[PDB]
Amino acid sequence: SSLAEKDIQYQLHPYTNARLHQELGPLIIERGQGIYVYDDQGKGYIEAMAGLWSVALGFSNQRLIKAAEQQFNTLPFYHLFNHKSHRPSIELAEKLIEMAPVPMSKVFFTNSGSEANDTVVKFVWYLNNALGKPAKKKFISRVNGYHGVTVASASLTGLPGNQRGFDLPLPGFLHVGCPHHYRFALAGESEEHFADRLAVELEQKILAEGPETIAAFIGEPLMGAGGVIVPPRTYWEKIQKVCRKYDILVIADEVICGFGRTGQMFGSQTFGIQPDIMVLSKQLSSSYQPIAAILINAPVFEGIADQSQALGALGHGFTGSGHPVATAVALENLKIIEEESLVEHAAQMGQLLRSGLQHFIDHPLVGEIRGCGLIAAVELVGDRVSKAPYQALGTLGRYMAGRAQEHGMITRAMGDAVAFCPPLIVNEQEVGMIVERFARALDDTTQWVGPGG
Amino acid sequence: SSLAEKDIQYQLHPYTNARLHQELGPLIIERGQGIYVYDDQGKGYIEAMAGLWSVALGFSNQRLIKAAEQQFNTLPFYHLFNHKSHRPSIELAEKLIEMAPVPMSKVFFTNSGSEANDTVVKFVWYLNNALGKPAKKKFISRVNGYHGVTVASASLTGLPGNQRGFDLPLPGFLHVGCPHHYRFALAGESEEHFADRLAVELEQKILAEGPETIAAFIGEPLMGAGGVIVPPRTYWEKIQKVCRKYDILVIADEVICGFGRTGQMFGSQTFGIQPDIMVLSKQLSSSYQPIAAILINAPVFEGIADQSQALGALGHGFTGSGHPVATAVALENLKIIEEESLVEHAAQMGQLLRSGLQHFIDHPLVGEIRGCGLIAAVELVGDRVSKAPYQALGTLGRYMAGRAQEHGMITRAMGDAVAFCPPLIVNEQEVGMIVERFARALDDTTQWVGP
Numbered sequence: 001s002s003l004a005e006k007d008i009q010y011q012l013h014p015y016t017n018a019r020l021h022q023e024l025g026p027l028i029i030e031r032g033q034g035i036y037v038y039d040d041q042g043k044g045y046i047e048a049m050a051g052l053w054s055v056a057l058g059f060s061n062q063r064l065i066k067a068a069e070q071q072f073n074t075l076p077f078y079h080l081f082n083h084k085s086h087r088p089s090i091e092l093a094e095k096l097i098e099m100a101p102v103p104m105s106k107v108f109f110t111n112s113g114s115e116a117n118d119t120v121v122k123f124v125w126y127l128n129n130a131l132g133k134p135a136k137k138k139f140i141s142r143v144n145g146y147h148g149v150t151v152a153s154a155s156l157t158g159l160p161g162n163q164r165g166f167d168l169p170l171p172g173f174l175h176v177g178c179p180h181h182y183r184f185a186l187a188g189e190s191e192e193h194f195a196d197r198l199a200v201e202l203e204q205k206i207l208a209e210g211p212e213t214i215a216a217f218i219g220e221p222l223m224g225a226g227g228v229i230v231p232p233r234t235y236w237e238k239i240q241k242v243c244r245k246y247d248i249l250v251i252a253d254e255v256i257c258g259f260g261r262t263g264q265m266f267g268s269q270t271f272g273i274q275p276d277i278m279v280l281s282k283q284l285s286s287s288y289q290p291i292a293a294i295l296i297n298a299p300v301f302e303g304i305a306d307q308s309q310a311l312g313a314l315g316h317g318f319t320g321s322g323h324p325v326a327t328a329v330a331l332e333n334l335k336i337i338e339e340e341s342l343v344e345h346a347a348q349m350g351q352l353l354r355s356g357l358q359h360f361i362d363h364p365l366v367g368e369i370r371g372c373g374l375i376a377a378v379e380l381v382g383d384r385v386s387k388a389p390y391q392a393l394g395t396l397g398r399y400m401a402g403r404a405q406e407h408g409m410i411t412r413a414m415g416d417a418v419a420f421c422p423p424l425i426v427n428e429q430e431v432g433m434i435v436e437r438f439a440r441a442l443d444d445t446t447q448w449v450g451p452g453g
Numbered sequence: 454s455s456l457a458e459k460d461i462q463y464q465l466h467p468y469t470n471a472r473l474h475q476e477l478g479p480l481i482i483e484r485g486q487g488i489y490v491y492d493d494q495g496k497g498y499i500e501a502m503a504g505l506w507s508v509a510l511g512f513s514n515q516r517l518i519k520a521a522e523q524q525f526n527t528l529p530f531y532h533l534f535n536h537k538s539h540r541p542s543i544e545l546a547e548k549l550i551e552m553a554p555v556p557m558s559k560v561f562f563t564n565s566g567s568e569a570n571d572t573v574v575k576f577v578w579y580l581n582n583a584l585g586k587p588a589k590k591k592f593i594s595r596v597n598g599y600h601g602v603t604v605a606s607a608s609l610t611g612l613p614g615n616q617r618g619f620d621l622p623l624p625g626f627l628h629v630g631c632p633h634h635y636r637f638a639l640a641g642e643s644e645e646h647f648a649d650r651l652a653v654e655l656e657q658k659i660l661a662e663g664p665e666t667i668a669a670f671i672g673e674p675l676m677g678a679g680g681v682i683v684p685p686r687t688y689w690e691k692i693q694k695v696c697r698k699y700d701i702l703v704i705a706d707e708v709i710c711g712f713g714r715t716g717q718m719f720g721s722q723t724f725g726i727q728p729d730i731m732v733l734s735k736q737l738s739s740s741y742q743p744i745a746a747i748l749i750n751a752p753v754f755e756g757i758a759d760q761s762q763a764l765g766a767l768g769h770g771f772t773g774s775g776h777p778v779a780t781a782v783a784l785e786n787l788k789i790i791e792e793e794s795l796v797e798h799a800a801q802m803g804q805l806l807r808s809g810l811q812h813f814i815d816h817p818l819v820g821e822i823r824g825c826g827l828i829a830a831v832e833l834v835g836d837r838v839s840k841a842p843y844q845a846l847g848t849l850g851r852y853m854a855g856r857a858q859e860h861g862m863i864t865r866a867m868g869d870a871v872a873f874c875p876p877l878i879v880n881e882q883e884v885g886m887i888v889e890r891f892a893r894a895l896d897d898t899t900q901w902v903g904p
């Protein structure tokens with residue numbers, strides 16, 4: 001049996017058509033270095049997605065690899081249960097609290113972003129029980145938001161592909177509108193008037209459900225997996241006013257935006273969010289180890305702490321919570337981002353990426369070019385006036401991502417939008433090569449469609 | 454400014470009283486080797502729990518550490534989404550399918566046991582929707598079962614500490630009896646008659662709820678975190694007959710029993726279980742990396758595969774699913790357990806542990822000694838005739854576990870029981886030292902409770 005035949009025989013793949021997988025088999029990735037990965041045929045690709053929006057320092061950072069070795073040879077596993085602790089969890093918790101964009105009290109560690117958001121749901125229910133508000137339990141999130149895949153975190157998620165066939169969302173998980181002006185604003189509506197209408201939708205949902213029943217609002221500052229959706233001017237200001245009016249917690253899901261993706265250290269800084277709770281993962285460790293972190297402010301911590309005393313202990317934790325190798329690698333990762341000024345470098349490389357894509361702004365298949373910092377998308381359309389797709393919605397995105405792969409670049413299609421999220425270490429020539437491979441894929445796609453006009 | 458002060462300032466601890474933590478601070482563990490860990494004052498402890506029921510090869514296995522280094526220097530991260538793959542995920546999936554105790558079709562990888570059980574809930578809902586049985590969605594688990602801490606997996610869990618204050622369980626997550634003869638059998642009742650009554654309870658729950666509404670039954674072959682509870686003779690045979698009668702999936706939660714804990718490779722082998730689905734973690738990697746695995750049989754795969762075609766793709770996955778460093782370490786871990794014959798070594802060390810503890814069967818505070826393979830527990834009581842606690846349930850267990858720590862041994866209290874789950878590499882004199890530190894803690898506890 002070949003390695004490809006064994007893959008087909010033995011693995012159920014995430015985010016894959018299992019029947020199509022039995023016919024086509026895998027694309028096997030063998031090795032990586034810098035911004036590049038190589039398949040088992042020796043073909044090289046720029047990883048323009050940094051894997052899954054995550055590999056901040058690229059695929060061969062020797063400082064992360066040596067940090068792992070040193071921790072393995074000291075203490076390769078221990079836990080944080082029943083007052084037990086270890087140095088790497090303590091030093092990473094200190095660094096995260098001291099770099100937070102608003103005053104924060106404590107860190108709780110998990111393996112995944114999905115586990116982290118699931119834990120935030122439990123901690124908010126625990127808190128409101130502790131404060132004697134047993135009705136204050138409902139969550140509000142947005143259409144096309146992504147918050148993970150557990151029964152609870154996939155209920156917060158607003159992408160139908162995460163819910164159809166899974167009996168989700170659960171009761172008490174509500175959704176308001178996707179803040180994408182290009183797709184959901186009225187003809188001739190300003191960004192500010194769109195933001196007004198979204199803030200009115202939220203207030204009317206709160207009043208309809210009963211304000212006393214609404215615990216929390218969760219959002220990505222900029223929505224990643226749902227299409228690199230930049231919210232309209234004044235959205236976060238007006239949404240937070242409505243939340244503060246009804247005593248609703250604001251949760252910033254920073255799993256993609258965290259650690260320099262949007263032009264500042266946090267999406268909360270870029271978009272003027274003052275959250276009660278932050279969720280972090282992905283670039284936290286450059287995905288070299290599975291780890292996520294929850295930051296909670298003083299009021300959230302004090303209520304949980306009171307209830308943990310009354311009930312004997314906090315009845316929650318994962319075996320891997322604060323894993324000493326994962327925390328050691330994340331701590332070294334954050335030191336490198338600070339020491340090499342990668343937040344400022346990423347902001348400069350992002351201006352070059354956006355300028356390169358903007359040469360195609362009057363192309364007949366280019367509907368919108370969006371992003372900020374070092375995250376971007378180009379949304380393709382069959383018709384710029386109607387914004388209608390070529391053939392079925394998703395046809396241009398799938399064709400573009402296939403052509404990009406042929407031209408030695410891995411990008412991700414989100415319907416008809418193709419994404420860019422390269423490693424923070426990308427250099428000026430490499431940004432040039434990313435835009436060149438985009439341009440070759442667009443030329444291929446244009447010849448296939450034949451726009452005329 | 455001290456490391457302990459920083460811990461108090463910045464960390465919320467799992468399974469901890471946060472206010473008591475602000476007063477006492479942490480016990481900081483600095484380093485480990487073999488079966489030992491050491492605190493920041495240089496004091497050494499036997500890790501009689503193998504960390505969290507998990508560190509099978511001990512705290513200094515150089516083969517696992519080199520396997521990690523080699524994978525880091527090749528490909529330190531990639532994913533399995535959208536047909537992408539990599540060698541360590543493929544070779545581990547092959548090894549897990551070929552070593553399975555019943556015929557299995559496919560592996561799906563997660564980071565944690567909690568994520569794995571949560572994923573099994575979603576996959577069973579997805580399957581029954583695919584088969585046109587939209588009502589067949591309810592799960593049955595047991596009192597004192599432990600299946601993890603997500604909103605869904607803590608609903609499967611049967612321990613009140615995991616549910617009180619969290620508004621759990623969710624609707625459609627049902628619980629039948631804990632199969633613990635010492636606590637729940639009627640006066641006189643044999644193990645076989647206890648098993649009969651538990652099988653009748655399950656059948657009556659299924660009929661009361663509507664058989665067409667019941668998707669799955671989940672159980673640990675023996676219950677770990679809920680008290681090291683060995684089920685009575687004939688339990689698993691009779692429960693499986695009832696499940697097969699109403700077309701109910703049997704899920705074996707092997708997160709603790711997996712890879713030689715119970716005297717055979719799997720708890721399913723020890724207890725004669727033929728599951729449709731298995732869940733694995735912990736000893737899978739000796740916890741050197743966060744990883745868990747779901748094994749599904751042919752019928753479960755064929756239904757999920759058809760639905761993934763109809764809906765365009767399987768709308769489920771974790772960033773870390775099949776992480777190449779975690780899969781590389783787990784693959785090397787399973788090779789070592791096989792090459793060093795640690796299933797048979799663990800079985801021999803387990804007989805020594807259980808025979809050593811049995812010397813204390815007639816101690817006035819010992820209610821029950823239980824175990825199988827290299828997992829055991831001693832339950833203390835304030836009165837052997839009534840089986841009543843001293844003061845309140847948990848008072849003896851808290852004091853016992855604290856005295857064991859003073860005597861250089863880390864054990865875990867489960868109410869008034871203390872647990873034993875040492876690394877599989879434990880040697881004969883090390884088992885002797887574990888029993889001796891238990892004995893010193895028991896002497897201390899006896900003098901404390903006093904006349």
Ligand SMILES: *Cc1c(COP(=O)(O)O)cnc(C)c1O
Pocket residue numbers: 111112113114115146147148149220224225253254255256281770771772773
């Ligand atoms: C990727 C992601 C998650 C989920 O993280 P996993 O580690 O894959 O469970 C949650 N929120 C956002 C915004 C994400 O991008």
Ligand SMILES: *Cc1c(COP(=O)(O)O)cnc(C)c1O
Pocket residue numbers: 317318319320506564565566567568599600601602673677678706707708709734
């Ligand atoms: C520990 C455990 C789990 C949960 O594993 P985590 O990795 O801590 O989420 C599930 N089932 C059983 C039987 C366990 O012992």
Ligand code: NA
Pocket residue numbers: 034425427
């Ligand atoms: Na470079």
Ligand code: NA
Pocket residue numbers: 073074075484485486
């Ligand atoms: Na050491």
